[PDB]
Design a protein around this ligand. Structure first.
Ligand SMILES: Nc1ncnc2c1ncn2[C@@H]1O[C@H](COP(=O)(O)OP(=O)(O)OP(=O)(O)O)[C@@H](O)[C@H]1O
Ligand SMILES: [Mg+2]
Lengths: 152, 96, 197, 194, 316, 146
């Protein structure tokens, strides 16, 4: 999968696109636009070149319920290989505002389509921190600190 | 530089038919160094517009200024096959 | 019959590696899909059959609506098997799957294969019933794995849903032992039942 | 192993829902354990290293696979008596424990004995407080064997000499293992306290 | 092939083989579904191939650039865990993605030498040194293959043995007529013996002396005897147009000659592409001398060079 | 012949032949995917290669800094170029072959130096042995060289 991933640089095209998508799907009030993040990966420096919206729903009553379109990803990947040769699915973004534990479950399914470990790239749509809004994550597995329960 | 060749006028013409008003934005990214220079918009001039002087109705009801990035290149197609009008940039505050 | 979208909930469990239908149940449930998919087309060629799984850790979308039987099976080959039914959860994702469609004239129905008893609750299922009949979604339960060694309380939800609907709700018993799973659902009402106003 | 290697080739596409390559790895682990008991420690370790390679290149493997591999690796360091090496790899078994039956009541009490003994005699351990707080050693302290064994572990955690030295006298007579590490254990409490 | 053998009939009776027939059906239905699985995966994939081939079509068709391959470099493929190039870049392991495997050095007709990431539909296999290749005009990549260059004058040069001068219409000239046979005609015809014995074949010959001694005559005749593919070249004829196109012509000539053997390649009056001084300025006519040199080298390259004979003439 | 045990038997032939056939047909359907699969990769890689874009070879005329070099190109002209952080600067030294973009004029990557064929053939293979007493009359002159 990938064992080379230290940092993710993000171009401001990607940060703006995600921002636009949230506001052009009409998804607000702590509901989720989730999209695929496109660009080179399987490198220490991951660079995300582009992004596009995916159809996505969530119900906050039970987060073990969500809608992800299986047709749409394949079709978009085919198109995206033509425009630049950089572009391939290297994760999925979440629109924040925080890291929910509901984000593991989605990441679990997302591993199948990807050719690497998928990345969970949080882009916050309301601005935060003295530091960046944008904070990147990778799914790894490890033993806890109670010496019990190996949790992803 | 930003100009148009014959082949691109043929491409231009059919967007004009599809959508009455439409623009062509032409990016030359290797004479660009401020991310904004050598980028202009262009739009077809009709053949009726030249002969009956209905070409400069676009100099009226606007700023009426045209800012050149290539003096030599724009002026050539400015009578021949296009009229150029200046480009502007925008964002909302969320974007900024 | 005509213009109908049907979300197949197909369970893949620890009760389905049993071989009461040849050569296990996984292999007989592959054969159920083909007959169902063709039949719909025979009534109306603009019918779409979708697929989700009540199986694994998290129920998920295996395939979306499509006019091809090929794509639906393509998605089913890689399913979990370690899980059990989660019946309440299945219904809420299937409702979401039936929202996204090419056209909305299509009937809303859910048919759920039961191989395994609920891992959820009665408290949950009571709620689901009131939820469904507002949106005219039928519950149609093919049971064949909650009657093998078990009892079902799902009879109650069928009747609570059934009113004049787009598709009526009915319970379809298929023996748990050999009777050839695939022909029994094909023979029994799955388009012979239709709605009314 | 020969029956699982034939089976798998047709059945991966035949069920079309199941896998059967998972099973082969685990058999190698059991084969490695049998060699350790038999006292052919080298035969198991080189089997175990080749098995290690395969596991790292997979990421979809069950939680059962990791549980058999670490258990087997721990028994290797216990034959060799590498105290430090045992402590950490037994901690990795504890994490990968399944609610599923793949343990007995015997095994809990016996890992608890072997952990405590290794810990005392490590050269770099200071995970005495980490053990105390852990379920395993918590439940059995009321039996005679694990009574002192708890109180030795506890007196080190807390740097305390009055309880520690009093215990050490008893264990020279009682246990001959700890009758030649007498010098080690007294240096160790002082080292942590410093 | 053969179903219900003698053996199955004794073993199991007809009634039993009915129960056998039913079990078979159930398993035939299982396999039958897999065919629908497999058909589909095949159907989508065809669609993908044609969707690509449509994008290619526009770039690929004529017009494009003509170039020559200097050499196929054969740069490394894979020595890292990411990309296919020595340097570590963002991409991942493929022929083309951001990864670059093999590459080749071409000399364009646009007067540039381009080292380029290699395409998917042109491989290094499909090349050899000194092959003419179509390179896309706008971005420089090997786009499609072409056969080797052919020129109108080169094509003409092969076959001109008639007029024939023989040795019955050339009065005397011995020792030299005998000497010419020994060098040329005699090993050309008994070529099989010369391999077996292990002696070398003469590595060409030089005939020289004041003009009007009848050198031109004797070389033409030499060729009549042996019935061979006679190529004639003359040092001002060989050079044509830009002087960097002079080098292709020598090579072209010798490509033809060695095929359809026996042959004689006779190069007349060498006094300006075989000068002794390197002071008289030449830069393109220098490459002409060098590509003359390859030919001699491959005579030495056969051991016994019976098949390919060369003759040379000069005035001084 | 004429009994009904034969009429029953012929039908079972169909049942077993189809069982086996459907198996020979699984193997065929698989091969049809694998055949398409290669063909797919070659046309696809082609499009990605166009987007990568050619380069122009040169060589260091003179190292000026540790991230910036001065070069001479084989197009004629001399440039002062930058160097990408992909490529090593140890493998860059004065006189070494390089290949640099026509988009930004930046050395992208190493071009290992092109071997000159003649001297290279002789480096590669050993030209030896010749025996001392296999040479006659120059025998003194071999020794003198030692
Ligand atoms: N030895 C000869 N026997 C017969 N005729 C001769 C002889 N030598 C010269 N001639 C006549 O003179 C003519 C002119 O001489 P020719 O062209 O053969 O000279 P050459 O030595 O081959 O020239 P160059 O040095 O210019 O290549 C010949 O065509 C032939 O008719
Ligand atoms: Mg002559």
């Amino acid at each position: 999968m990938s064992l080379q991933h230290e940092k993710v640089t993000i171009a401001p095209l990607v940060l703006l696109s995600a921002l636009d998508h949230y506001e052009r799907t009409q998804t607000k009030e702590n509901k989720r636009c989730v999209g695929v993040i496109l660009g080179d990966a399987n490198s220490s420096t991951i660079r995300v070149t582009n992004s596009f919206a995916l159809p996505f729903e969530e119900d906050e009553k039970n987060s073990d319920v969500w809608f992800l379109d299986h047709n749409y990803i394949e079709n978009m990947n085919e198109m995206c290989k033509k425009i630049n040769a950089k572009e391939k699915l290297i994760g999925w973004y979440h629109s924040g505002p925080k890291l929910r534990a509901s984000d593991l479950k989605i990441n679990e399914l997302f591993k199948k389509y990807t050719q690497n470990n998928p990345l969970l790239l949080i882009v916050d749509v309301k601005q935060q921190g003295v530091g960046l809004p944008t904070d990147a994550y990778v799914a790894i597995e490890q033993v806890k600190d109670d010496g019990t329960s190996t949790e992803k | 530089g930003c100009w148009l060749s014959s082949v691109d006028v043929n491409t231009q013409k059919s967007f004009e038919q599809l959508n009455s008003r439409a623009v062509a934005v032409v990016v030359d990214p290797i004479q660009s160094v401020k991310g904004k220079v050598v980028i202009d918009a262009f739009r077809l001039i009709d053949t009726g517009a030249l002969i009956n002087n209905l070409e400069p109705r676009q100099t009226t009801s606007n700023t009426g200024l045209l800012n050149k990035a290539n003096i030599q290149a724009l002026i050539h197609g400015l009578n021949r096959h296009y009229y150029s009008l200046n480009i502007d940039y925008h964002k909302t505050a969320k974007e900024t | 019959m005509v213009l109908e979208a049907t979300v197949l909930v197909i369970d893949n469990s620890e009760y389905s590696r049993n071989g009461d239908f040849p050569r296990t149940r996984f292999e007989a449930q592959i054969d159920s899909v083909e007959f169902i998919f063709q039949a719909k087309r025979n009534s109306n060629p603009e019918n779409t059959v979708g697929l989700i799984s009540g199986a694994g850790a998290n129920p998920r979308v295996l395939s979306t609506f499509t006019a091809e039987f090929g794509k639906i099976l393509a998605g089913l080959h890689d399913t979990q098997i370690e899980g059990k039914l989660h019946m309440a959860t299945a219904l809420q994702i299937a409702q979401l799957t039936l929202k996204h469609r090419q056209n909305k004239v299509q009937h809303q129905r859910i048919v759920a294969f039961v191989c395994s008893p609920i891992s959820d609750s009665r408290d949950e299922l009571i709620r689901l019933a009131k939820t469904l009949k507002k949106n005219n979604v039928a519950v149609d339960i093919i049971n064949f794995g909650e009657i093998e060694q078990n009892t079902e309380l799902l009879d109650e939800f069928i009747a609570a849903v059934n009113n004049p609907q787009e598709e009526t709700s009915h319970l379809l018993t298929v023996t748990p032992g050999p009777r050839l799973l695939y022909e029994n659902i094909a023979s029994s009402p799955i388009i012979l039942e239709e709605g009314s106003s | 192993k020969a029956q699982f290697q034939e089976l798998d080739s047709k059945k991966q596409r035949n069920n079309g829902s199941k896998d059967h390559g998972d099973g082969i790895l685990l058999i190698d682990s059991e084969i490695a354990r049998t060699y350790l008991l038999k006292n052919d420690l080298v035969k198991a370790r080189d089997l175990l290293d080749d098995l290690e390679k395969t596991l790292d290149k997979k990421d979809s493997i069950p939680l059962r696979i990791t549980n058999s591999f670490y258990s087997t690796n721990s028994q290797y360091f216990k034959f060799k008596n590498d105290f430090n090496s045992f402590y950490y790899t037994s901690l990795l078994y504890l994490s990968t424990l399944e609610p599923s039956t793949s343990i007995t009541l015997a095994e809990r009490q016996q890992l608890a004995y072997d952990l405590s003994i290794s810990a005392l005699l490590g050269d770099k351990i200071y995970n005495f407080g980490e053990l105390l707080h852990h379920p395993i050693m918590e439940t059995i302290v009321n039996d005679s064997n694990y009574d002192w064994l708890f109180q030795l572990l506890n007196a080190l955690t807390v740097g305390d000499f009055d309880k520690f030295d009093s215990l050490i006298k008893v264990q020279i007579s009682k246990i001959p293992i700890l009758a030649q590490h007498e010098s080690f254990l007294r240096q160790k409490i002082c080292l942590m306290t410093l | 092939g053969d179903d219900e053998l003698d053996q199955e009939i004794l073993n199991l009776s007809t009634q039993e083989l009915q129960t056998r027939a039913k079990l078979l059906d159930n398993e035939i239905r299982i396999f039958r579904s897999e065919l629908q699985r497999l058909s589909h995966e095949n159907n989508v994939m065809l669609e993908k191939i044609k969707d690509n081939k449509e994008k290619i079509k526009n770039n690929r068709q004529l017009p494009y650039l003509v170039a020559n391959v200097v050499e196929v470099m054969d740069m490394n493929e894979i020595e890292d865990k990411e990309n296919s190039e020595s340097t570590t870049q963002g991409g991942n392991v493929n022929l083309d993605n951001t990864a670059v495997g093999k590459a080749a050095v071409v000399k364009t007709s646009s007067r540039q030498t381009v080292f380029l990431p290699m395409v998917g539909l042109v491989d290094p296999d499909k090349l050899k040194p000194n092959d003419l290749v179509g390179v896309n005009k706008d971005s420089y990549l090997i786009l499609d293959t072409l056969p080797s260059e052919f020129d109108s004058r080169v094509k003409a040069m092969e076959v001109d043995e008639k007029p024939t001068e023989t040795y019955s219409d050339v009065g005397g000239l011995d020792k030299q007529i005998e000497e010419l046979v020994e060098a040329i005609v005699l090993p050309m015809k008994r070529a099989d013996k010369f391999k077996d014995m292990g002696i070398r074949a003469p590595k060409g010959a030089l005939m020289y002396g004041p003009p009007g001694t009848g050198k031109t005559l004797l070389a033409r005749a030499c060729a009549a005897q042996t019935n061979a593919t006679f190529l004639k070249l003359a040092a001002p004829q060989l050079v044509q147009m830009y002087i960097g196109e002079g080098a292709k012509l020598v090579r072209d000539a010798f490509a033809l000659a060695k095929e359809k053997a026996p042959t004689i390649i006779f190069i007349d009056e060498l006094d300006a592409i075989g000068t002794k001084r390197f002071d008289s300025e030449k830069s393109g006519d220098r490459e002409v001398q060098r590509t003359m040199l390859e030919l001699l080298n491959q005579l030495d390259g056969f051991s016994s060079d019976d098949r390919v004979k060369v003759l040379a003439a000069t005035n001084r | 012949e004429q009994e009904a045990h034969n009429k029953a038997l012929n039908q079972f032939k169909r049942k077993l032949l189809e069982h086996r056939r459907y198996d020979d047909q699984l193997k065929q359907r698989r091969q049809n995917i694998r055949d398409l699969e290669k063909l797919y990769d070659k046309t696809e890689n082609d499009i990605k290669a166009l987007q990568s874009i050619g380069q122009l070879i040169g060589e260091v005329m003179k190292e000026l800094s540790e991230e910036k070099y001065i070069v001479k190109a084989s197009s004629g002209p001399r440039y002062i170029v930058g160097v990408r952080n992909s490529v090593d600067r140890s493998k860059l030294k004065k006189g070494v072959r390089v290949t640099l973009d026509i988009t930004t004029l930046t050395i992208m990557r190493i071009l290992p130096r092109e071997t000159d064929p003649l001297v290279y053939n002789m480096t590669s293979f050993e030209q030896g042995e010749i025996t001392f007493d296999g040479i006659g009359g120059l025998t003194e002159q071999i020794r003198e060289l030692r």
